[PDB]
Write a protein that binds this DNA or RNA. Structure first.
Length: 231
DNA sequence: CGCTGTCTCGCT
DNA sequence: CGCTGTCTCGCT
DNA sequence: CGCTGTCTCGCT
């Protein structure tokens, strides 16, 4: 339980509906407002008229707010994948992760094959390719991925398979940005092949980790440690 | 994802 | 498709 | 470098 960073200001909202995959309508202080959604997943378990969400204002654009997360067991599940990215950057920088206790980000969205992976990190040892994925689909004590078929996600895992096999370091970090979870596993029904490809990748030396994060009402983003991975 | 309009399922 | 926001191109 | 205008990218 380390404090990673704070989101300010942070406002409770009532979720009304999605206008489209990038925009939700929320009610804040009697007013109806448009909120950016940065998470391509379905989030059907979260995106239900009436549930309490949490937003933060921004300047400009076609939306005045960013929908960051939802009430979940008294705290906050973080659905915003840019915020998840920042919390992961902070983890690296502060060296709170055992696998990377002295490393730095040298490139973001570095090109591999005909795709782009998330990070190129530099260890004391050598070069490492880290891809992150949002795991906010719950089953009991498990945070899971995905909640729908991701053809983009298949090909990304393949690049990690094609890199590892061919003598390169390749990692995948599932961000379990839910409170009250201690394990990760893939949701087979969400995508049949990503389950398969995860074992295939796990066999080819591709490191697979999963982290536990939540947000408090204060806006405080908390890292809870690694989740037990069960690929 | 939600977008239109229409057409499809088993179990109660 | 258009939907957000921010990113990337060559040639002039 | 910034200069015009237009046309190009993946990921969210």
């Amino acid at each position: 339980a380390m404090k990673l960073m704070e989101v300010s200001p942070l406002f409770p909202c009532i979720f009304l509906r999605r206008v489209n995959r990038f925009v939700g309508l929320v009610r804040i202080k009697e007013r109806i407002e448009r909120a950016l959604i940065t998470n391509t997943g379905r989030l059907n378990e979260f995106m239900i008229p009436g549930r309490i969400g949490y937003c933060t204002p921004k300047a400009g654009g076609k939306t005045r707010y960013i929908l960051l997360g939802f009430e979940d067991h008294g705290k906050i599940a973080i659905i915003d994948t840019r915020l998840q990215g920042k919390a992961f950057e902070k983890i690296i920088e502060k060296e709170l992760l055992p696998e990377l206790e002295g490393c730095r980000i040298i490139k973001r969205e570095p090109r591999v094959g005909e795709s782009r992976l998330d990070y190129l990190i530099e260890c004391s040892k050598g070069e490492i390719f880290v891809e992150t994925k949002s795991a906010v689909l719950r089953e009991g004590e498990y945070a899971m991925y995905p909640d729908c078929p991701s053809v983009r996600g298949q090909r990304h895992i393949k690049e990690l398979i094609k890199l590892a096999r061919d003598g390169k370091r390749a990692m995948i970090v599932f961000i379990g940005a839910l409170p009250n979870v201690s394990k990760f596993k893939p949701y087979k029904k969400g995508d049949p092949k990503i389950a398969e490809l995860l074992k295939e990748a796990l066999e080819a030396g591709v490191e697979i980790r999963a982290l536990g994060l939540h947000m408090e009402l204060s806006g405080e983003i908390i890292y809870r440690g690694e989740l037990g991975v069960e690929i």
